[model samples]
Target: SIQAEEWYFGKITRRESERLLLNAENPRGTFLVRESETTKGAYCLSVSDFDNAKGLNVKHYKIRKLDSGGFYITSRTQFNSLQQLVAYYSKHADGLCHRLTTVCPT
Candidate 1:
């Protein structure tokens, strides 16, 4: 999960923050491209907490990246989204080889 101004998608799930750490040089795992850089097709990752607990307990899970890049997980928030923000993130995300909203949960 990724986010913009707030940390939802990547927070609890440790999305971008953790991804940034795993990235060898942190090339671009998670970052807000400056307004000037948006035209360059830049993007960032922001995690969220949007679960109703869903049997979640203190433990760990990992979310991978656009490519078979890699991933990491840590105790964090529950990833959530509002309609507008969800649309926004989808527009900019890499989608990990699948189309937006197409991936099914295991």
Candidate 2:
């Protein structure tokens, strides 16, 4: 069923996810990825030096796992408080799992 699939395959592409989150308030590129700290099956805060690619000067959003086994891009931001990233992923949470999964496997 779609519900089960979304729960299991919580992963998603940044592009598509961002597309879904697009909004007038979005500050393009304002999104969040797994903790660069490498916390197993966990998500939390980060630093620019921790993720040079999507860090330093770049905007970010908060992402947390929901009790439903999905994710929740909380109403928070790590950098510029961008709304696009969280807004999109939060809405996409109606979306799984794996080892080291693809850090940004899009």
Candidate 3:
């Protein structure tokens, strides 16, 4: 379960998540996972980044579950758990705005 990881900030709102990601030590690609506010069984991956045009910003991606019991951001790639998914994205951004560089402190 996501609760097993320190990066998982269960049930925090998107706004509160943005505040957490905006920390001075959180450089571009810092991220955290949180329960989706609008979706009962889903989660969100929130990342901090700096855009050349937009300056500092946080991006949120929905982590959806398949009926057969797998997790994915974009359907093509799937993971057995949120932890596995985060591991994949940590090394490569793939379709994410940036690679996950650090986990937000608990």
Candidate 4:
């Protein structure tokens, strides 16, 4: 379940999440999942990075739910749970800025 995952920080605010990732030692691709503040029943994926143009930054992606109770950042690839979603993105960035590299430590 999502709550069991170390990377899942339920109900955390966007600003707090940004602070967490921004302060991380290994910033690139470090990410965490949190309850979406703006969208009820949806989740947010916050990723950290240091890009040439943006410098140190945190990117946010909306993780939408399908009618079948699946999750997806992009409609083309859906996963049955947050675990599967994180695993898939870890191996391949797909549509994300970078492949998920590290989990925001407790």
lDDT of 2 by residue, 1-106 (tens): 3224212224444344444334334333333343423334444321111233543232233355545455544423232322333344434432211111112212
Q: What is the C-alpha RMSD of each candidate to the true structure, in Å?
A: 15.1, 12.6, 1.2, 1.2
Q: Which ten residues in a row have the lowest lDDT in candidate 2?
A: 96-105
List candidate 3 segments past 4 Å from native.
none
Q: Which residue pairs in candidate 2 have backbone atoms (N, alpha carbon, C) closer than 3 angstroms, thus clashing?
A: 6-95, 8-96, 10-96, 48-56
lDDT string for model 3 (48-105, tens) is 9987897778999999998899999988999998888999999998888899999986
- Using all chains and alpha carbons, the TM-scores for the candidates as numbered come to 0.18, 0.26, 0.93, 0.92
**TM-score for predicted model 3 compared with the true structure:** 0.93
Please provide, for model 4 over 18-70, each residue's C-alpha lDDT reduced to its tens digit, 9 standing for 90 to 100.
88888738668999999999998789999988888988888899999988888
Instruction: List ranges where model 1 is wrong by over 4 Å.
Output: 1-81, 94-99
Q: How big is the positional error of residue 42 in model 4, measured in Å on the Cα after superposition? A: 0.6
lDDT of 2 at 30: 32
Taking all chains together, the TM-score of candidate 2 against the true structure is 0.26
**For each candidate, what is the lDDT?**
0.28, 0.33, 0.90, 0.89
Model 4: how far is 43 from its true place, Å?
A: 0.2
Rank order (by TM-score, best first): 3, 4, 2, 1
